[PDB]
Amino acid sequence: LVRPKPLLLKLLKSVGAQKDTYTMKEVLFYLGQYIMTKRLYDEKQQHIVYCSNDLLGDLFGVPSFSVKEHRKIYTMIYRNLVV
């Protein structure tokens, strides 16, 4: 298991999760569903995600990102985990 830090924990629970420990697969799953459900992705280039003025921007520390930058996204995710 991994333990999300406070802001990521809040984001995960906002999707409906209630627990404090997750597998990595669960963290990725709920984070992806958070973006999907909240319609944060660009309609035309759907790997672009808008983070400004959102919890997700608060915890990643960027205004936007591209899902194609795999190492960059995992780096932001792990900064918000205790593993």
Partner: peptide
């Protein structure tokens, strides 16, 4: 989901995790 040409956000997101 074709990781050579994702068209959708969740397919990009799946491809991130391979």
């Amino acid at each position: 989901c074709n990781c050579k040409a994702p068209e959708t956000f969740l397919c990009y997101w799946r491809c991130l995790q391979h």
